[PDB]
Design a protein around this ligand. Sequence first.
Ligand SMILES: *[C@@H]1O[C@H](CO)[C@@H](O[C@@H]2O[C@H](CO)[C@@H](O[C@@H]3O[C@H](CO)[C@@H](O)[C@H](O[C@H]4O[C@H](CO)[C@@H](O)[C@H](O)[C@@H]4O)[C@@H]3O)[C@H](O)[C@H]2NC(C)=O)[C@H](O)[C@H]1NC(C)=O
Ligand SMILES: *[C@@H]1O[C@H](CO)[C@@H](O[C@@H]2O[C@H](CO)[C@@H](O[C@@H]3O[C@H](CO)[C@@H](O)[C@H](O[C@H]4O[C@H](CO)[C@@H](O)[C@H](O)[C@@H]4O)[C@@H]3O)[C@H](O)[C@H]2NC(C)=O)[C@H](O)[C@H]1NC(C)=O
Ligand SMILES: *[C@@H]1O[C@H](CO)[C@@H](O[C@@H]2O[C@H](CO)[C@@H](O[C@@H]3O[C@H](CO)[C@@H](O)[C@H](O[C@H]4O[C@H](CO)[C@@H](O)[C@H](O)[C@@H]4O)[C@@H]3O)[C@H](O)[C@H]2NC(C)=O)[C@H](O)[C@H]1NC(C)=O
Ligand SMILES: *[C@@H]1O[C@H](CO)[C@@H](O[C@@H]2O[C@H](CO)[C@@H](O[C@@H]3O[C@H](CO)[C@@H](O)[C@H](O)[C@@H]3O)[C@H](O)[C@H]2NC(C)=O)[C@H](O)[C@H]1NC(C)=O
Ligand SMILES: *[C@@H]1O[C@H](CO)[C@@H](O[C@@H]2O[C@H](CO)[C@@H](O[C@@H]3O[C@H](CO)[C@@H](O)[C@H](O)[C@@H]3O)[C@H](O)[C@H]2NC(C)=O)[C@H](O)[C@H]1NC(C)=O
Ligand SMILES: *[C@@H]1O[C@H](CO)[C@@H](O[C@@H]2O[C@H](CO)[C@@H](O[C@@H]3O[C@H](CO)[C@@H](O)[C@H](O)[C@@H]3O)[C@H](O)[C@H]2NC(C)=O)[C@H](O)[C@H]1NC(C)=O
Ligand SMILES: *[C@@H]1O[C@H](CO)[C@@H](O[C@@H]2O[C@H](CO)[C@@H](O)[C@H](O)[C@H]2NC(C)=O)[C@H](O)[C@H]1NC(C)=O
Ligand SMILES: *[C@@H]1O[C@H](CO)[C@@H](O[C@@H]2O[C@H](CO)[C@@H](O)[C@H](O)[C@H]2NC(C)=O)[C@H](O)[C@H]1NC(C)=O
Ligand SMILES: *[C@@H]1O[C@H](CO)[C@@H](O[C@@H]2O[C@H](CO)[C@@H](O)[C@H](O)[C@H]2NC(C)=O)[C@H](O)[C@H]1NC(C)=O
Ligand SMILES: *[C@@H]1O[C@H](CO)[C@@H](O[C@@H]2O[C@H](CO)[C@@H](O)[C@H](O)[C@H]2NC(C)=O)[C@H](O)[C@H]1NC(C)=O
Ligand SMILES: *[C@@H]1O[C@H](CO)[C@@H](O[C@@H]2O[C@H](CO)[C@@H](O)[C@H](O)[C@H]2NC(C)=O)[C@H](O)[C@H]1NC(C)=O
Ligand SMILES: *[C@@H]1O[C@H](CO)[C@@H](O[C@@H]2O[C@H](CO)[C@@H](O)[C@H](O)[C@H]2NC(C)=O)[C@H](O)[C@H]1NC(C)=O
Ligand SMILES: *[C@@H]1O[C@H](CO)[C@@H](O[C@@H]2O[C@H](CO)[C@@H](O)[C@H](O)[C@H]2NC(C)=O)[C@H](O)[C@H]1NC(C)=O
Ligand SMILES: *[C@@H]1O[C@H](CO)[C@@H](O[C@@H]2O[C@H](CO)[C@@H](O)[C@H](O)[C@H]2NC(C)=O)[C@H](O)[C@H]1NC(C)=O
Ligand SMILES: *[C@@H]1O[C@H](CO)[C@@H](O[C@@H]2O[C@H](CO)[C@@H](O)[C@H](O)[C@H]2NC(C)=O)[C@H](O)[C@H]1NC(C)=O
Ligand SMILES: *[C@@H]1O[C@H](CO)[C@@H](O[C@@H]2O[C@H](CO)[C@@H](O)[C@H](O)[C@H]2NC(C)=O)[C@H](O)[C@H]1NC(C)=O
Ligand SMILES: *[C@@H]1O[C@H](CO)[C@@H](O)[C@H](O)[C@H]1NC(C)=O
Ligand SMILES: *[C@@H]1O[C@H](CO)[C@@H](O)[C@H](O)[C@H]1NC(C)=O
Ligand SMILES: *[C@@H]1O[C@H](CO)[C@@H](O)[C@H](O)[C@H]1NC(C)=O
Ligand SMILES: *[C@@H]1O[C@H](CO)[C@@H](O)[C@H](O)[C@H]1NC(C)=O
Ligand SMILES: *[C@@H]1O[C@H](CO)[C@@H](O)[C@H](O)[C@H]1NC(C)=O
Ligand SMILES: *[C@@H]1O[C@H](CO)[C@@H](O)[C@H](O)[C@H]1NC(C)=O
Lengths: 155, 157, 159, 185, 185, 186
Amino acid sequence: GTFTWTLSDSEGKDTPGGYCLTRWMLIEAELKCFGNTAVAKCNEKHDEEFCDMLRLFDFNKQAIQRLKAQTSIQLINKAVNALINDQLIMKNHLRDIMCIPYCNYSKYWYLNHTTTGRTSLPKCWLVSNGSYLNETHFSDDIEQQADNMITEMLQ
Amino acid sequence: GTFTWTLSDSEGKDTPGGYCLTRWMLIEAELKCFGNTAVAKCNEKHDEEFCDMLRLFDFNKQAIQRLKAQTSIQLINKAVNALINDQLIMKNHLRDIMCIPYCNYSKYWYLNHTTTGRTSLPKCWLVSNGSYLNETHFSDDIEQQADNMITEMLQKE
Amino acid sequence: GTFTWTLSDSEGKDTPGGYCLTRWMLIEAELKCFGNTAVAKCNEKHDEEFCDMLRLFDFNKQAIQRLKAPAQTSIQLINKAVNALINDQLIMKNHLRDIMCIPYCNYSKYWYLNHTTTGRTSLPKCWLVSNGSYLNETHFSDDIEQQADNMITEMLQKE
Amino acid sequence: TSLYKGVYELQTLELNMETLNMTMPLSCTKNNSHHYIMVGNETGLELTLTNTSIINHKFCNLSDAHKKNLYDHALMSIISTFHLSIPNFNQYEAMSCDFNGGKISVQYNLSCGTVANGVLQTFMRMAWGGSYIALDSGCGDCIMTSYQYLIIQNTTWEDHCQFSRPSPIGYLGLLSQRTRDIYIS
Amino acid sequence: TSLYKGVYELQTLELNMETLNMTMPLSCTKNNSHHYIMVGNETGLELTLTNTSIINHKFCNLSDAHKKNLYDHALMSIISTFHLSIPNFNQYEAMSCDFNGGKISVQYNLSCGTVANGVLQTFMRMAWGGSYIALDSGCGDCIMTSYQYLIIQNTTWEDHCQFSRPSPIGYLGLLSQRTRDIYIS
Amino acid sequence: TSLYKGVYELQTLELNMETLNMTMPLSCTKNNSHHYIMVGNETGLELTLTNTSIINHKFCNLSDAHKKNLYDHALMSIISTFHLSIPNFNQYEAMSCDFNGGKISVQYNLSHCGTVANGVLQTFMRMAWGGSYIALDSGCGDCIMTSYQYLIIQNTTWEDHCQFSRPSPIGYLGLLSQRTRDIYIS
Ligand SMILES: *[C@@H]1O[C@H](CO)[C@@H](O[C@@H]2O[C@H](CO)[C@@H](O[C@@H]3O[C@H](CO)[C@@H](O)[C@H](O[C@H]4O[C@H](CO)[C@@H](O)[C@H](O)[C@@H]4O)[C@@H]3O)[C@H](O)[C@H]2NC(C)=O)[C@H](O)[C@H]1NC(C)=O
Ligand SMILES: *[C@@H]1O[C@H](CO)[C@@H](O[C@@H]2O[C@H](CO)[C@@H](O[C@@H]3O[C@H](CO)[C@@H](O)[C@H](O[C@H]4O[C@H](CO)[C@@H](O)[C@H](O)[C@@H]4O)[C@@H]3O)[C@H](O)[C@H]2NC(C)=O)[C@H](O)[C@H]1NC(C)=O
Ligand SMILES: *[C@@H]1O[C@H](CO)[C@@H](O[C@@H]2O[C@H](CO)[C@@H](O[C@@H]3O[C@H](CO)[C@@H](O)[C@H](O[C@H]4O[C@H](CO)[C@@H](O)[C@H](O)[C@@H]4O)[C@@H]3O)[C@H](O)[C@H]2NC(C)=O)[C@H](O)[C@H]1NC(C)=O
Ligand SMILES: *[C@@H]1O[C@H](CO)[C@@H](O[C@@H]2O[C@H](CO)[C@@H](O[C@@H]3O[C@H](CO)[C@@H](O)[C@H](O)[C@@H]3O)[C@H](O)[C@H]2NC(C)=O)[C@H](O)[C@H]1NC(C)=O
Ligand SMILES: *[C@@H]1O[C@H](CO)[C@@H](O[C@@H]2O[C@H](CO)[C@@H](O[C@@H]3O[C@H](CO)[C@@H](O)[C@H](O)[C@@H]3O)[C@H](O)[C@H]2NC(C)=O)[C@H](O)[C@H]1NC(C)=O
Ligand SMILES: *[C@@H]1O[C@H](CO)[C@@H](O[C@@H]2O[C@H](CO)[C@@H](O[C@@H]3O[C@H](CO)[C@@H](O)[C@H](O)[C@@H]3O)[C@H](O)[C@H]2NC(C)=O)[C@H](O)[C@H]1NC(C)=O
Ligand SMILES: *[C@@H]1O[C@H](CO)[C@@H](O[C@@H]2O[C@H](CO)[C@@H](O)[C@H](O)[C@H]2NC(C)=O)[C@H](O)[C@H]1NC(C)=O
Ligand SMILES: *[C@@H]1O[C@H](CO)[C@@H](O[C@@H]2O[C@H](CO)[C@@H](O)[C@H](O)[C@H]2NC(C)=O)[C@H](O)[C@H]1NC(C)=O
Ligand SMILES: *[C@@H]1O[C@H](CO)[C@@H](O[C@@H]2O[C@H](CO)[C@@H](O)[C@H](O)[C@H]2NC(C)=O)[C@H](O)[C@H]1NC(C)=O
Ligand SMILES: *[C@@H]1O[C@H](CO)[C@@H](O[C@@H]2O[C@H](CO)[C@@H](O)[C@H](O)[C@H]2NC(C)=O)[C@H](O)[C@H]1NC(C)=O
Ligand SMILES: *[C@@H]1O[C@H](CO)[C@@H](O[C@@H]2O[C@H](CO)[C@@H](O)[C@H](O)[C@H]2NC(C)=O)[C@H](O)[C@H]1NC(C)=O
Ligand SMILES: *[C@@H]1O[C@H](CO)[C@@H](O[C@@H]2O[C@H](CO)[C@@H](O)[C@H](O)[C@H]2NC(C)=O)[C@H](O)[C@H]1NC(C)=O
Ligand SMILES: *[C@@H]1O[C@H](CO)[C@@H](O[C@@H]2O[C@H](CO)[C@@H](O)[C@H](O)[C@H]2NC(C)=O)[C@H](O)[C@H]1NC(C)=O
Ligand SMILES: *[C@@H]1O[C@H](CO)[C@@H](O[C@@H]2O[C@H](CO)[C@@H](O)[C@H](O)[C@H]2NC(C)=O)[C@H](O)[C@H]1NC(C)=O
Ligand SMILES: *[C@@H]1O[C@H](CO)[C@@H](O[C@@H]2O[C@H](CO)[C@@H](O)[C@H](O)[C@H]2NC(C)=O)[C@H](O)[C@H]1NC(C)=O
Ligand SMILES: *[C@@H]1O[C@H](CO)[C@@H](O[C@@H]2O[C@H](CO)[C@@H](O)[C@H](O)[C@H]2NC(C)=O)[C@H](O)[C@H]1NC(C)=O
Ligand SMILES: *[C@@H]1O[C@H](CO)[C@@H](O)[C@H](O)[C@H]1NC(C)=O
Ligand SMILES: *[C@@H]1O[C@H](CO)[C@@H](O)[C@H](O)[C@H]1NC(C)=O
Ligand SMILES: *[C@@H]1O[C@H](CO)[C@@H](O)[C@H](O)[C@H]1NC(C)=O
Ligand SMILES: *[C@@H]1O[C@H](CO)[C@@H](O)[C@H](O)[C@H]1NC(C)=O
Ligand SMILES: *[C@@H]1O[C@H](CO)[C@@H](O)[C@H](O)[C@H]1NC(C)=O
Ligand SMILES: *[C@@H]1O[C@H](CO)[C@@H](O)[C@H](O)[C@H]1NC(C)=O
């Protein structure tokens, strides 16, 4: 079927829903927190790659905190389809085969409001032949996300 | 993929789509009927366990009324994924493994209006170590359902 | 999982989102174009058969354009991509209906409502068939009635 | 030419699946006895229901055929998908094959719950369009046919699809239910 | 009883899965040692955990059993699903069987990562209701039980489901994770 | 730095997948020849493409290896997923193994479009998702070719190997679905 794993909430949060990535989950960066309005889209949509990664990071966090075993591969083999969209990474595989910019699940981009501090859901930074795309090559993607940010900010 | 089976409805009913469970589908209870506005969420959501059971009970009924055969296991071996979310029951298996109160698909709770009779979609009554949770331990889940019931009854008017 | 293939937009279209079927994709017909408002439902819903066909036709189009043709028609590509284009349980649904003597969808003919003056169309629903013959309009009249009401609601939602 | 609500006219469209021939196989049927699968515009497969057999030896030299890599890899992948999709296949004596020189040819000797039901259920799925004509089945885990053998042979492309239009939906459906129902070996 | 916002009364609902007996199997448990999977209203299947063995020969004549098509095909399907669902099954010596006359009977000789873990994980899944009472494992992959053998035999239907209600959720979950974890042979 | 609508600043983040090592395998590449799959912080697997062979006998004693339960069960599970994910594998001779003492080592002879070398390279392309194109030379085109003659898979110990591409579980997780999806009759 589709992913049923819901992201677990920590204890020192102001609104039930948001998710945070520690400084050890991000390379050359400090911790970053994302609001409930953004991560809520992870339960609705099926197509977001960054959501698939949050469910992987959360599952790894929950499995370490609650169990003891590194033959823990048997566990992920059961849970894979409940955390990620298998066809979503097949889509990226198809794009790579067709010389189309694809997502290798490493870098993501998002829009961050200057004074509100509110952020969009991080979308995947595409790559083509071993180099990420310039901002100039997906600027209309960023423009569309900025429009969705305004209509969400009004609501 | 995901479930595509739509819940058929019986001939003698007030509203099309509204589902009912007979007294033989419930244990120690008479027949209970749920309105269209509630069961309509079964086609939208992929997350609800009570919806996967309705598609199992309906498929059982339809297979009996329309076919003749017990080795009918070959039929459910084909149609399982068109009825239930496989990863939803894997979810409760993960929760059971991790000592989290899980859903064993037996008991369900829902809100019911004093005068209107309209009911929420039954959510699964969780269990932890062979005993269902008290109302006190998922009280904030019932509070959220009552707020969704108010916002839905307001959209009627 | 579920289908993730997004339908590719042609270069000359006025609104980004619509999809068109050429005169060679349709039998005994000229080319037909569907608006973004209709095709947008293909990304939301999981149950529409006509949407699964669009992703098949687009995938076939994209694979021919972007991949140098194989010497002898390798089938490995579609075996990888199938679940990313179609809903397997949707065609299993029609296989269940055919087994139970219920009118089913054999993925050939589709019906839709076209407004005589505005030109907007609903998403083509599948024209069901029972025992080697499509159903008359008279046997699914109330399915067409419901679609007109949703068309009304969608047209009013613009104003 | 039928109006709904005074403004909405009912219109139709019929998809021509023949243009998908370069990407995916396409099943169709000629008459009651003969059915086909088309891979591209040259090769293909012939599913025949005949009371006349074509193979009399009860061996299937699959390992030899694999080593002598002559057959079309696409055609055998359809033969594998078909045979794996058979549920409760327990009598290997009925399956008899001949892959001499790459020419693939497989015969299923027919004769509820028997091996003939599982082979006809998979045949019913494979040629989705116009399979009911040969089944005589109606509606009911039990399919019975008068024919005694199902013979699958490689063939060349011609205008065969006369009773039903070609379609890939048949093949695409067996891909998910591939090894879903197989006993322990 | 208890009303929320003064107008919504909290009500319950407990489903009776026993009515699904004709379409899908139903697992349940009697006590710590005895568990059952029911198919229909007559034929059934018992899987039990005993320190006493029932099969002393270490052979599993599966090919002979298939040829002599005596057994119930439904019970063979759920026992194929069970053996296939075992992850990292590498010691075939523990599996011993006896299918003489259609009477199916399979014994798993128990004794982190051993073959006993994979068989008990699949048993934990199979009888979803009331498997914890026999595991004595809590939460922690690695399952350890005092019992030495898991014996699976065919049986007749009775009012066995005394500790947990029957449900199909157990069997339905193994169907997807069927051949998902199997080594090369 | 880069502002949109005067109030939305374009910001990025890069995930460090290395912390998922205890739950799932992680693929990555060192150079053109060497690629790796990491299981935990100790064991692992080394996929190397070399014109030099490492096994000369054309037998694979898997049944013997299963009985003598010495090998790591995790590495055996990922070596099974690889061999099953190969499509249209029909030349068992190229498959040669040596599991003496739990030391797992598998060699694929690519010397033997449509050949057995394509299917093994297609599965290798998926497995080490990051940085597989460097070894392929293929570009875009189905048919994959390489100068190298052998694909050798050996068990190894964990080190700072992921130099060209970052570690990722995306490769392995994708083969799990397309596991037994394309295999011929035996
Ligand atoms: C989900 O979890 C719940 C809670 O853990 C679980 O509910 C339990 O179900 C069993 C089986 O129905 C109940 O046991 C019953 O207990 C009463 C007295 O308390 C007995 O009278 C019953 O015996 C009758 O039925 C027997 C078997 O048919 C007959 O042999 C006998 O003669 C009687 O006629 C029966 O033993 C148990 O009380 C509940 N527990 C609670 C807390 O309610 C449920 O089974 C789980 N669901 C699934 C699908 O596993
Ligand atoms: C879905 O179900 C429908 C209804 O059961 C089914 O439609 C049928 O398709 C066949 C095949 O296209 C139609 O048969 C045609 O009939 C016309 C006359 O009515 C003939 O002229 C055609 O013959 C030509 O085709 C030959 C072979 O291609 C050529 O050699 C030659 O040029 C012939 O002139 C053809 O036989 C049939 O009429 C319809 N039936 C209905 C009721 O419309 C459809 O095939 C099903 N879809 C799938 C995918 O199975
Ligand atoms: C997704 O695609 C991108 C772009 O193709 C890809 O990014 C690349 O990742 C590698 C690996 O991190 C980067 O290589 C680094 O380069 C810097 C400077 O050039 C070096 O200092 C680094 O070396 C350190 O790490 C080594 C291994 O840990 C140590 O051995 C060494 O001593 C150093 O400590 C490292 O080699 C590369 O620069 C980027 N490329 C770009 C354009 O940013 C990414 O890996 C892809 N993701 C996946 C999951 O494949
Ligand atoms: C296995 O499942 C079948 C069907 O789900 C069960 O049979 C069903 O039993 C109920 C109650 O006995 C029957 O309801 C009856 O309907 C008649 C009217 O037709 C009414 O007069 C009776 O008073 C009663 O309400 C139901 O018809 C029947 N269905 C079928 C198809 O037989 C059966 O009990 C289950 N067996 C086990 C062992 O669980
Ligand atoms: C299941 O497996 C276990 C362990 O692999 C088997 O137990 C072993 O059975 C043998 C033969 O009965 C035992 O050998 C005997 O040991 C005693 C000393 O305890 C010795 O005096 C005798 O001369 C004889 O050699 C062996 O000890 C025993 N091992 C263990 C660990 O229990 C068991 O037989 C297997 N069951 C089946 C049904 O295959
Ligand atoms: C494999 O993954 C594990 C866990 O995902 C990695 O271990 C983690 O390493 C970080 C950084 O060293 C640890 O954070 C530390 O937390 C303590 C307080 O708890 C703090 O004092 C330290 O300064 C540091 O912030 C984290 O606890 C640790 N987690 C576990 C479960 O051990 C490990 O590094 C990874 N190994 C490889 C080879 O990738
Ligand atoms: C959005 O931007 C703001 C400001 O640029 C970020 O807030 C900063 O967070 C860092 C580390 O958490 C602090 O050291 C700064 O003091 C913060 N600045 C302000 C003005 O609050 C915020 O983290 C960004 N959001 C995301 C998701 O990256
Ligand atoms: C919600 O509550 C109403 C009233 O309490 C229930 O309706 C009653 O149902 C019983 C049994 O079906 C009848 O005998 C009564 O006549 C009904 N009363 C009224 C006022 O309608 C209704 O069944 C409840 N909903 C559910 C799903 O249980
Ligand atoms: C197989 O499919 C191809 C492409 O879908 C068909 O070729 C097309 O035919 C139309 C009409 O003649 C041309 O306008 C296109 O340019 C062709 N496309 C290509 C890529 O050649 C072909 O007719 C189909 N063959 C069969 C036997 O159905
Ligand atoms: C279905 O069509 C096939 C092919 O047109 C018919 O098979 C032919 O039958 C005649 C008479 O026995 C033979 O001489 C031909 O060699 C056969 N051709 C092939 C390709 O096998 C078949 O008879 C038709 N069946 C029905 C019921 O109409
Ligand atoms: C193929 O052979 C079978 C069996 O010989 C034929 O079926 C028989 O048809 C006759 C006449 O209708 C009946 O009296 C028999 O009872 C049937 N036997 C069985 C086992 O069904 C069938 O008609 C033949 N088909 C063809 C095309 O020749
Ligand atoms: C669980 O229930 C079963 C069946 O009621 C019990 O098995 C019986 O045990 C007695 C005493 O040894 C035997 O005489 C019977 O022949 C057994 N019956 C069957 C069907 O095997 C079993 O003892 C019970 N176990 C527990 C722990 O309560
Ligand atoms: C089945 O046999 C095992 C092994 O003989 C029993 O487990 C032993 O129980 C005793 C008493 O508690 C312990 O001292 C031993 O250490 C246990 N051995 C092992 C290997 O765990 C078990 O109790 C027996 N079960 C039954 C129902 O008789
Ligand atoms: C890729 O890196 C590996 C490891 O650093 C290189 O393999 C070494 O090659 C030399 C010369 O053949 C041997 O003496 C070493 O034993 C090898 N090391 C290992 C671990 O196998 C390899 O040469 C590099 N390849 C390229 C193209 O840079
Ligand atoms: C796989 O097993 C076979 C048979 O046990 C081994 O082949 C034997 O090897 C010995 C020692 O070289 C010879 O004396 C025998 O003649 C061989 N027998 C046969 C039938 O070839 C083989 O060495 C094993 N391979 C591995 C890698 O363990
Ligand atoms: C591995 O061996 C192959 C085959 O000997 C090498 O490929 C040859 O390279 C030369 C020089 O470019 C060409 O003239 C040949 O035509 C190539 N042969 C083939 C079959 O492609 C390859 O370069 C070697 N690789 C390494 C790393 O030494
Ligand atoms: C709707 O009708 C108009 C006018 O008849 C026509 O131009 C248009 O192509 C139709 N739409 C479709 C999708 O066929
Ligand atoms: C098919 O089976 C029947 C009955 O078992 C037998 O008479 C006939 O000779 C068989 N045909 C072939 C070709 O094996
Ligand atoms: C089947 O293939 C072989 C080898 O390619 C060929 O000789 C034979 O003619 C083919 N059969 C048909 C009916 O075309
Ligand atoms: C198992 O099946 C055989 C044959 O159907 C039967 O004789 C035997 O009694 C069955 N076992 C039980 C315990 O009912
Ligand atoms: C690999 O195959 C080639 C050609 O078949 C052969 O020359 C070579 O000796 C083989 N190498 C091994 C190690 O089997
Ligand atoms: C592979 O494993 C064996 C046994 O654990 C060990 O002896 C050998 O050194 C390992 N190989 C490498 C390259 O580490």
